[PDB]
Design a protein around this ligand. Structure first.
Ligand code: NA
Ligand code: NA
Ligand code: NA
Ligand code: NA
Ligand code: NA
Ligand code: NA
Lengths: 117, 117, 117
């Protein structure tokens, strides 16, 4: 899975090690191995969420097969909100998530695409 | 709506308050409330646009229902170019926009997805 | 084409001029002019790739017509991995690429969309 987290919290208000802990969290939530989770955190940005510039965060989650239905994205959302509200000390009104299905031909790995791996 | 703005202008050449003013602009252009607009600005990046590294900016706009047609994206583009050229002191050759329709099952909010809200 | 490169290498470990050289590389690989290539590099991020926080990079490539098949994305992947492993001094295990087809109605340019240009 690919997770991208944008936040207006400065880097020194994003707990040390968050990107590693988000791999373990995404593994348990999405049912994929932690060693296939990719996380990118971009702190210190200028952000408004719901029209407001108080601390907030946006997460994007992309994966093959598991982020394409409303019923399973509802479950994934509940778990990622519990992880992020606690780690970032943010209320649930200050986080949004977007889910993006991917296909094997879209993923470049080791100089080829996943269709051939 | 979700707006993401990447620019190679340093933070001190992005006018104070831009992320808030972009919520008001996106509300009027897209016909959605300012308190449902989310803006992320990422300044100080290394960018080439049309092969050139002079100051530039890229905007991505994602929303349900309103960014899926050429005719209405033409109108949205005209208005967002007027806003960004003036705010960022950039010529129209130095900005590009991408539009991305979203569905309700893709948006995680308050620990569920918008399909159930 | 639009290329976005996220990396946990600090800016001073991303060779000067990379964004310009990536325009020339993408032109030859994708068969589009260098003056229609757009590159965004976001260094200094916090990243885990395959569960590990050692130096790494993620590239996203979006274009009309040329990034929609497994067979041609396999070729594009091979060439972009050769360019990035050498430029960033990274092993092939430390880079991933995602490919995203775009349509003309999604691209805002000069205050309109590409459908009308
Ligand atoms: Na993602
Ligand atoms: Na889940
Ligand atoms: Na967007
Ligand atoms: Na409009
Ligand atoms: Na891209
Ligand atoms: Na190629």
């Amino acid at each position: 899975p690919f997770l991208e987290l944008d936040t207006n919290l400065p880097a020194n208000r994003v707990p040390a090690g968050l990107e590693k802990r988000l791999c373990a969290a995404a593994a348990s939530i999405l049912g994929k191995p932690a060693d296939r989770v990719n996380v990118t955190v971009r702190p210190g940005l200028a952000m408004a969420l719901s029209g407001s510039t108080e601390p907030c965060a946006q997460l994007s989650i992309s994966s093959i097969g598991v982020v394409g239905t409303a019923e399973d994205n509802r479950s994934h959302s509940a778990h990622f909100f519990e992880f992020l509200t606690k780690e970032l000390a943010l209320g649930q009104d200050r986080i949004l998530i977007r889910f993006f299905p991917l296909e094997s031909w879209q993923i470049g790995k080791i100089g080829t695409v996943m269709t051939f791996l």
